[PDB]
Amino acid sequence: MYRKGAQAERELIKLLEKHGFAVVRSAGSKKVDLVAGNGKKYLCIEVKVTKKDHLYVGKRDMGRLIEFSRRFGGIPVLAVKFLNVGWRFIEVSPKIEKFVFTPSSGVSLEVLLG
Amino acid sequence: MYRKGAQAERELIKLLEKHGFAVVRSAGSKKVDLVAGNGKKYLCIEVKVTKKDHLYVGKRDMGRLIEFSRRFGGIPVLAVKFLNVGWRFIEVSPKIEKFVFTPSSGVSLEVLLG
Numbered sequence: 664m665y666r667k668g669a670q671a672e673r674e675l676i677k678l679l680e681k682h683g684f685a686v687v688r689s690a691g692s693k694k695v696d697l698v699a700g701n702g703k704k705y706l707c708i709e710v711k712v713t714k715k716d717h718l719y720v721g722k723r724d725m726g727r728l729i730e731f732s733r734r735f736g737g738i739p740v741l742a743v744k745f746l747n748v749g750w751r752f753i754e755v756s757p758k759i760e761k762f763v764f765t766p767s768s769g770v771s772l773e774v775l776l777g
Numbered sequence: 778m779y780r781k782g783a784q785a786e787r788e789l790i791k792l793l794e795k796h797g798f799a800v801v802r803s804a805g806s807k808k809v810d811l812v813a814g815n816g817k818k819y820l821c822i823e824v825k826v827t828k829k830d831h832l833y834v835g836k837r838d839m840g841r842l843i844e845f846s847r848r849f850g851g852i853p854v855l856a857v858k859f860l861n862v863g864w865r866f867i868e869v870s871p872k873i874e875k876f877v878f879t880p881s882s883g884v885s886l887e888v889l890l891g
Binding site for chain 2: 664683684685686687691694695701702703705731732734
């Protein structure tokens, strides 16, 4: 186990924990990368990291995130670390046809409050 | 890096999914083994396996379980697979720290849920 993006995941887990959330990273790779919760809000996260100012994500992966989050009772979140601007969080919808994003598509960790 | 009873954990994941739950297994072994949700109920689970007809559960594990469940906002659950008899569950109260678990002192998956 341990995806190639394992280091990025660890960093996020720390950020989230730093904000009062309990978090676990998945051992298998057929669900979502992380699942977090603080008693009020519940997050199901897919983690990515890029050097560009835009990123393309496959339907398969995003469809999986949504189906999982829906059944679990958590918000389907794509966390992207743009190696220049910082972490951006995007709540994805099944209405989306092509999953390509820029930072303005998401919000900051804090803003993601609720 | 892989824990004993990973086979039992995979087994419990299927059972839960049969009941409508979305579930992930933890990569690290410092939190809880499984984390589940169905849209209205959230479970944080500690998985155990024994060839005996009883199992002593320590203070350290239960304290770890209760604390993580409290922060995450899920029901702390101990799940034990008693070979030659089946799975048994018990929602652990924050007022208990150690105990000997037997198949009868626990409940079936159906009752833990409904």
